[PDB]
Design a protein around this motif. Structure first.
Motif, short mmCIF file in Angstrom:
data_model
loop_
_atom_site.label_atom_id
_atom_site.label_comp_id
_atom_site.label_asym_id
_atom_site.label_seq_id
_atom_site.Cartn_x
_atom_site.Cartn_y
_atom_site.Cartn_z
N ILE A 1 4.96 4.59 8.89
CA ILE A 1 5.93 5.02 9.12
C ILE A 1 7.37 3.48 10.03
O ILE A 1 6.85 3.15 10.11
N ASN B 1 14.38 6.57 15.99
CA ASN B 1 14.64 7.18 15.33
C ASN B 1 13.56 6.88 14.24
O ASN B 1 12.75 5.95 14.35
N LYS B 2 12.81 8.02 13.34
CA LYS B 2 12.22 7.53 12.44
C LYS B 2 12.85 7.49 11.13
O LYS B 2 13.34 8.41 10.82
N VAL B 3 12.49 6.61 10.06
CA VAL B 3 12.40 6.91 8.68
C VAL B 3 10.93 6.41 7.98
O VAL B 3 10.75 5.62 8.48
N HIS B 4 11.64 6.98 6.68
CA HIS B 4 10.44 6.45 5.93
C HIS B 4 8.86 6.67 5.97
O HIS B 4 8.05 6.46 6.11
N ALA B 5 8.26 8.26 6.25
CA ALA B 5 7.08 8.77 6.38
C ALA B 5 6.74 8.69 5.16
O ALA B 5 6.61 9.43 4.31
N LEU C 1 -0.47 11.05 13.83
CA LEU C 1 -1.29 11.52 14.23
C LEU C 1 -2.77 11.13 15.05
O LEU C 1 -3.74 11.81 16.08
N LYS D 1 -0.98 7.61 7.44
CA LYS D 1 0.22 7.84 7.42
C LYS D 1 1.09 6.36 7.53
O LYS D 1 0.42 5.25 8.29
N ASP E 1 13.34 3.06 13.83
CA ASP E 1 13.94 2.66 14.07
C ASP E 1 14.92 2.25 15.56
O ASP E 1 13.98 3.91 16.06
N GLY F 1 5.47 9.58 17.57
CA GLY F 1 5.12 10.37 15.23
C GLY F 1 3.72 10.59 15.07
O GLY F 1 3.63 11.57 13.87
N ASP G 1 -4.21 8.44 10.14
CA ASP G 1 -4.49 9.89 9.55
C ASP G 1 -3.39 9.86 8.14
O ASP G 1 -3.34 10.93 7.78
#
Ligand SMILES: C[C@]12CC[C@H](O)CC1=CC[C@@H]1[C@@H]2CC[C@]2(C)C(=O)CC[C@@H]12
Lengths: 261, 55, 226, 338, 128
Positions: D78, D86-90, D53, D76, D81, D51, D74
């Motif tokens: 992230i 999966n991803k949360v809280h970007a 860049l 970021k 999980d 996810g 970038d």
């Protein structure tokens, strides 16, 4: 002679199919070498060329003329694959333009997806339309023997395979000239003296660009107008185009060879 | 400067005051810890896919 | 059931974050970050145009981010590695201790760094008027003994035409930088030297043109043409 | 008088050297000469998170060994999980030059810092439900190279101004300042009991402090170049350092000496990351040649390779239960190996 | 630990000769590129010369190009600077610096103050 032409075409198509399959499996198995847009466009072009060569070989080898539907289907698929190959060469040229002429603000979402949509949809639309006018435009009763499933209307052949290729060739040649002009400008920088001495890498890259942009299809114009030697040159340099694509973009690259080891 | 010199010398004496056990004893302690907990080390012993959360 | 419920909630949260992330990627791609580096504080980096300073400027509807290092120690060995992905390093040198030798050493270290081997350098030579005043007035000769043997190159194109001695000195300094640039690296990154008088607004146009050439070369390298 | 002080310091260094030499009686290899080898274990890329860049500078595992946090240039942050990829809280960062990130033991907060000389603490759970900057800490004159949460209310940071600082998140002020490093501190590692922590800096030295008052109990000098990464042994009586001289070293407390060095002739790239397995038998070291070497910590023989990246790794970590190892890289890819 | 000790150099008449010897310990000498830097009274550190691994890439600053020569003995783990024609303005404290990373063509921050891999330096004064 006509008989020799068939042999050269068969050998070239076989070599191109084999080495294009090699290139496709190499570029799909190893994800490390297909990060950039040119590699993905190369994968798409190799797939299109492999399909075109395989279907051409199947059409030439098989001799079916008691089955109207099968002949029409084979001719339609051959026309579609030829158009897809031309469109992918044109899309390579367009990517070249978006990378070298217009340098800034070139990012768009789903770049490869949109390129694939155009490249595999425009030929599909063309073949669907020409089928819609009449399905007999593809029956029987370029064609190597007398009986060979191909376009027979003589009108859509010029519009959809000559004019289409003419536009694609104009774009490809213009972008080829642009790339060569920029490359010569870089070679003539002369920052401190004798800058950028000619080496074997530069002509290899130029030849790879020529075969990737499909400039070698220009020999068609002289071959059709007649110039028997030009006809042989056209057949030789366009039948094994995939072979040279494999040489210049799979075997020539050092990273691909490193992945092989 | 001179202040850095006295601070460094003070740190040096303070470091020199401490005491150290034999290197062999520390080596044996490390080996004993490694052997005692060797069973519960999923990276050491491949874990079956039944209870591997990253199946 | 709880498990499918929380999996669905997590999946929809992931989808929302993916949307926001592609939106952010669109912005990030069209930025062209630059690193504005100077040999010392004497160099007029500020007029060329804590911890880090940001400058946003648009040239022909093309965004540009210039990062100037602020409250950091003189040892740049570690944090310079954070700038290996920038479009260019704008290296400003005052052409007026031997500060020129220090600038040359810093440029050599930047050029020959393992992580910056693919980063191009836009070299700016400030203090052109100061250099002219020093040359006309009766320190460059003694600092560089090879300057006596140096001769003005054929493609000098001295547009200002102030003197045939000032041009010789400025081109000697430019050649001093270009020697390192050409000898150390070929086919990976390029050095673009320019003369600036610190009273001209054409600096951003030169940076824009050099960045265009840098990205063109990077794209050409994908086809192994370069 | 300055020469006299220099002579005094040199004599003290010599005396410490003789004390260490008298302490050493047998090498750790001689002790573990009869230990059965690991067995040339291999671990495949169980998962790939893609996810980010720009290049990934840091990542940190959660306490539950399921959630991890990654920071990329970038701007970021992230929280992946890893079980369900999966991803949360970007979390978007104010400054895009983050070089470190930390996960609170409780799992309630996330820290990140970089070239802005500031450590940002983000509250993961809020009534609004949106991650926001809980507090900004700015007591450093140099870039923040590392940060670690002490007890969800105190944080230990190391900066490029050759100093470490123990903060109070509630009041947002420096509680203690640890000084004594010449080169800027590159990494720090907390002890399992959170009573001590080691710090490796740009000089060849690594210093051990105690957070209660911070007076630099011990100093270890075995390396020859900048110490990029440091990790602490699970039992708490040792730690491992990786430097730019293409070697890893295992120092131990309460002996103030080297135990064993991990190096190979065909390795000429510096170490960027160091971590230990759950039992401490394995030492995972990230390299600049895009590979990760898994060493038998008791024998200094290479036991595994993890060549799944395209650029330098720059960060890796092992779960609390030791189930999986996460490696970041400069190719903007995270990989979970098991 | 990394330790560089410089020796040689005192009061020398103008036009005289001097030899500075840097003895290194705590690292493999042959893996690193060595540097000689100097600090004049109230002027700050300045780079004088450098030599790569096993020599063969010697370079000097312009001021001392014709006079100073730098050599190294990897077997003896030593660095040498010979100053055959001294002039008054090169009165300075001379330091032997070891660049931060081994097997590197580039090396950073030798002239930077508070640099870790630098010696204590020796005073070299040229006066009547
Ligand atoms: C090259 C090409 C057209 C392009 C195909 O990929 C390969 C090939 C099949 C038979 C060839 C034809 C070009 C025209 C030819 C050469 C004729 O007129 C006789 C056989 C024909």
């Amino acid at each position: 002679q006509m008989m020799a032409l068939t042999f050269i075409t068969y050998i070239g198509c076989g070599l191109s199919s084999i080495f294009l399959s090699v290139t496709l499996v190499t570029y799909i198995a190893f994800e490390k070498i297909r990060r950039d847009y040119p590699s993905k466009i190369l994968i798409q072009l190799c797939a299109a060329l492999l399909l075109l060569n395989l279907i051409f070989l199947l059409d030439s080898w098989i001799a079916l003329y008691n089955t109207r539907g099968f002949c029409i289907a084979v001719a339609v698929f051959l026309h579609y694959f030829l158009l897809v190959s031309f469109t992918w060469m044109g899309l390579e040229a367009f990517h070249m333009y978006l990378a070298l002429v217009k340098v800034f603000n070139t990012y768009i979402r789903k770049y490869i997806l949109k390129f694939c949509i155009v490249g595999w949809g425009i030929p599909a639309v063309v073949v669907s339309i020409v089928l819609t006018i009449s399905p007999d435009n593809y029956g029987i009763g370029n064609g190597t023997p007398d009986d060979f499933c191909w376009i027979n209307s003589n009108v859509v052949f010029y519009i959809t395979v000559v004019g289409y290729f003419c536009v694609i060739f104009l774009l490809n040649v213009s972008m080829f000239i642009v790339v060569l002009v920029q490359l010569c400008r870089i070679k003539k920088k002369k920052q401190l003296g004798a800058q950028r001495k000619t080496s074997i890498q530069d002509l290899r890259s130029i030849a790879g660009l020529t075969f990737l942009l499909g400039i070698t299809w220009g020999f068609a114009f002289f071959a059709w107008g007649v110039n028997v030697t030009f006809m042989y040159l056209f057949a030789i340099f366009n039948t094994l185009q995939g072979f040279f694509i494999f040489i210049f973009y799979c075997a020539a690259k050092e990273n691909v060879r490193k992945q092989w080891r | 400067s001179i202040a850095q010199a006295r601070k460094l010398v003070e740190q040096l004496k303070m470091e020199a005051n401490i005491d150290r056990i034999k290197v062999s004893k520390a080596a044996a302690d490390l080996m004993a810890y490694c052997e005692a907990h060797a069973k519960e080390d999923p990276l050491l012993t491949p874990v079956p896919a039944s209870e591997n959360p990253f199946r | 059931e709880d498990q499918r419920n929380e999996e669905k909630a997590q999946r929809e949260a992931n989808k929302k974050i993916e949307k926001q992330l592609q939106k952010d990627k669109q912005v990030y791609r069209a930025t062209h970050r630059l690193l504005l580096l100077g040999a010392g504080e004497s160099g007029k980096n500020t007029i060329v145009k804590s911890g880090i300073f940001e400058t946003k400027f648009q040239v022909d509807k093309v965004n540009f981010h210039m990062f100037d290092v602020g409250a950091q120690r003189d040892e740049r060995r570690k944090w310079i590695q954070c700038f290996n992905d920038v479009t260019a390093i704008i290296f400003v040198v005052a052409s007026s201790t031997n500060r020129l030798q220090a600038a040359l050493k810093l440029f050599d270290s930047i050029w020959n760094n393992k992580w910056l081997r693919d980063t191009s350098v836009i070299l700016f030579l400030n203090k052109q008027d100061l250099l002219a005043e020093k040359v006309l007035a009766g320190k460059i000769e003694d600092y560089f003994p090879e300057f006596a043997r140096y001769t003005t190159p054929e493609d000098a194109t001295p547009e200002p035409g102030e003197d045939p001695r000032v041009t010789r000195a400025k081109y000697f300094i430019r050649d001093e930088f270009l020697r390192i640039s050409t000898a150390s690296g070929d086919g990976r990154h390029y050095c673009y030297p320019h003369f600036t008088c610190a009273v001209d607004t054409e600096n951003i146009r030169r940076v824009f043109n050099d960045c265009r050439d840098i990205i063109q070369r990077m794209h050409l390298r994908q086809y192994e043409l370069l | 008088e300055l020469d006299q002080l220099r002579q005094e310091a040199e004599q003290l260094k010599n005396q410490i050297r003789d004390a260490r030499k008298a302490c050493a009686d047998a090498t750790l290899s001689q002790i573990t000469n009869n230990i059965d080898p690991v067995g040339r274990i291999q671990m495949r890329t169980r998962r790939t998170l893609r996810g980010h860049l720009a290049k990934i500078y840091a990542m940190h595992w959660g306490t539950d060994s399921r959630l991890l946090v990654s920071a990329s240039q970038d701007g970021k942050l992230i929280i992946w999980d890893s079980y369900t990829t999966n991803k949360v809280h970007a979390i978007p960062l104010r400054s895009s030059w983050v070089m470190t990130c930390a996960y609170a033991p409780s799992g309630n907060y996330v820290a990140c810092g970089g070239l802005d000389n500031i450590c940002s603490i983000y509250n993961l759970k809020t009534r609004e439900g949106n991650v926001r900057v809980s507090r900004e800490l700015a007591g450093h004159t140099g870039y923040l190279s590392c940060c670690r949460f002490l007890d969800d209310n105190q944080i230990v940071t190391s900066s490029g101004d050759t100093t470490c600082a123990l903060w109070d998140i509630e009041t947002g002020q420096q509680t203690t300042t640890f000084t004594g490093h010449t080169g800027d501190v590159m990494s720090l590692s907390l002890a399992p009991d959170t009573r001590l922590f080691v710090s490796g800096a740009c000089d060849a030295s690594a210093k051990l402090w105690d957070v209660r008052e911070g007076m630099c109990r011990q100093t270890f000098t075995g390396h020859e170049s900048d110490i990029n990464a440091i990790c602490f042994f699970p039992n708490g009586n040792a730690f491992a350092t990786g430097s730019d001289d293409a070697t890893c070293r295992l120092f131990d407390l309460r002996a103030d000496q080297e135990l064993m060095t991990y190096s190979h002739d065909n390795i000429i790239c510096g170490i960027t990351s160091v971590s230990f397995s759950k039992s401490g038998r394995l030492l995972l070291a990230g390299y600049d040649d895009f590979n990760c070497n898994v060493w038998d910590a008791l024998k200094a023989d290479r036991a595994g390779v993890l060549a799944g990246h395209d650029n330098r790794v720059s960060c890796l970590g092992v779960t609390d239960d030791g189930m999986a190892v996460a490696t970041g890289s400069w190719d903007s890819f995270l990989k979970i190996w098991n | 630990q990394v330790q560089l000790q410089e020796s040689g150099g005192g009061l020398v008449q103008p036009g005289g000769s001097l030899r500075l010897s840097c003895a290194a310990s705590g690292f493999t000498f042959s893996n690193y590129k060595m540097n000689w830097v100097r600090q004049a009274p109230g002027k700050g550190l300045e780079w004088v010369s450098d030599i790569s691994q096993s020599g063969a890439s010697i370079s000097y600053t312009g001021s001392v190009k014709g006079r100073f020569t730098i050599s190294r003995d990897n077997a003896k783990n030593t660095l040498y600077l010979q100053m055959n024609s001294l002039k008054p303005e090169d009165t300075a404290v001379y330091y032997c610096a070891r660049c931060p990373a081994p097997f590197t063509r580039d090396c950073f921050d030798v002239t930077s103050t508070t640099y870790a891999y630098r010696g204590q330096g020796t005073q070299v004064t040229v006066s009547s």
